[PDB]
Amino acid sequence: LKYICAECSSKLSLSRTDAVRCKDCGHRILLKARTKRLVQFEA
């Protein structure tokens, strides 16, 4: 899933015209979580 709640740390996702809060606490700040990508670095 996309996002993560701040207060209770439960994964969730949102849609268009959907409320921006968690569904177990109603906290109003969501961290966009990290997915799998291919960033290249030089060691």
């Binding site: 409320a19 569904k23 177990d24 606490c25 109603g26």
Partner: protein
């Protein structure tokens, strides 16, 4: 254009959206009746004709405007015909018991696939669709009239009921020995219209539908109260002891817990007339438990930010080899009680049985106490008029 993205609107075509989803609620009762009550599949294609024949008269309306008399009682009305036209022995007693126990879908408008129909305009249509009533004084007996007055019946379908099994069903509900079927069997041969299979009522397109009480099963049950009046007031051989009149009357007043008796109890709840008051004040520890066990499995079919306060109240404070005997083991037990079978005071023992069995059929048939007496007294004159 975005203002019409928010709430969808329909004009004159709402009556078809009313009627297309009317076919959807029709189908759910049909597929239920063939599954839990194992009805035949060709019975459906009767109803697929039957629903179409009324609907053709709907598209035969001379005005484009609506004015169309439609109800949820009409839904069970057309399901009554195809059960009697195919001669399945179900009656108007069972349809009350099958909608007032929430076995089949009657009261719900939420099972309509509401993401395409109840979004549009349910404004007053779900006031018809949500079953916000019980049929008070036999509205179904007027609702079989308006469906015969829209679709003809004397030449299309067979207008008869298996009234020898209706008379079988009436005996085993109470505690009578089977000779009382045969005593009644000649009375429905004697005074019923030059012996005939009992017909459905006729096509009455008056808005008051008379005062005549020519309904079919009302003629059957009013006949039953005449015989038990007459077979007990004229038992000249002393074949029926005064202890025997007691032992049946005490056997009816005992309450046993079975799915027939529990299914009787729920229609005492929706009952508008007294004695519905003390019908829920004198139960057992047991009888309310299967009232709640019915509730926690058949009010899960209820009618559908703040969920978080709700899901916390029901979280911490939650709702947490058969002892319930069958339909025969009590009926065998209730028959073995009245084995004492092998004098102006017996009128009081007869007069007390005449009210128990009259309150019984009043409840189980959704019929007023007034209209039972008008039906039975016009019958009472017209059974003495053929003999005296």
């Amino acid at each position: 254009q975005s203002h019409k993205k928010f709430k969808k609107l329909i004009g004159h075509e709402a009556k078809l959206l009313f009627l297309k989803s009317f076919q959807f609620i029709l189908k759910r009762q049909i597929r239920w009746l063939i599954t839990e009550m194992r009805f035949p599949k060709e019975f459906e294609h009767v109803a697929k004709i039957i629903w179409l024949k009324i609907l053709k008269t709907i598209n035969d309306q001379p005005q484009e405007e609506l004015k169309l008399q439609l109800h949820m009682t009409s839904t069970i009305s057309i399901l009554y015909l195809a059960s009697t036209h195919l001669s399945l022995p179900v009656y108007t007693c069972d349809y009350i018991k099958w909608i007032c126990t929430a076995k089949m879908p009657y009261f719900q408008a939420s099972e309509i696939l509401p993401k395409s129909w109840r979004i549009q305009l349910p404004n007053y249509y779900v006031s018809i669709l949500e079953g916000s009533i019980s049929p008070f004084n036999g509205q179904l007996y007027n609702k079989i009239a308006l469906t015969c007055g829209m679709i003809h019946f004397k030449e299309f379908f067979n207008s008869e009921i298996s009234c020898q099994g209706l008379l079988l069903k009436l005996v085993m509900q109470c505690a009578l020995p089977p000779e009382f079927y045969f005593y009644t069997k000649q009375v429905i041969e004697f005074e019923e219209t030059d012996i005939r299979n009992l017909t459905l009522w006729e096509r009455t397109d008056e808005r008051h539908t008379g005062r005549v009480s020519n309904h079919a099963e009302l003629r059957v049950l009013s006949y039953f109260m005449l015989t038990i009046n007459w077979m007990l007031s004229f038992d000249r051989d002393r074949q029926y002891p005064l202890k025997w009149i007691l032992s049946l009357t005490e056997s009816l007043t005992q309450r046993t817990t079975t799915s027939e008796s529990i299914g009787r109890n729920i229609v005492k709840v929706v009952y508008p007339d007294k004695p519905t008051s003390s019908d829920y004040f004198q139960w057992s520890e047991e009888e309310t438990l299967e009232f709640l066990k019915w509730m926690e499995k058949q009010f899960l079919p209820t009618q559908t930010d703040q969920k978080i306060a709700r899901r916390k109240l029901y979280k911490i404070f939650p709702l947490d080899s058969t002892h319930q005997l069958t339909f025969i083991e009590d009926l065998q037990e209730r028959y073995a009680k009245q084995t004492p079978f092998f004098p102006p005071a017996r009128k009081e023992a007869i007069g007390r049985l005449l009210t128990h069995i009259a309150s019984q059929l009043l409840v189980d048939f959704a019929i007023s106490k007034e209209q039972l007496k008008d039906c039975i007294s016009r019958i009472k004159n017209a059974c003495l008029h053929r003999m005296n």
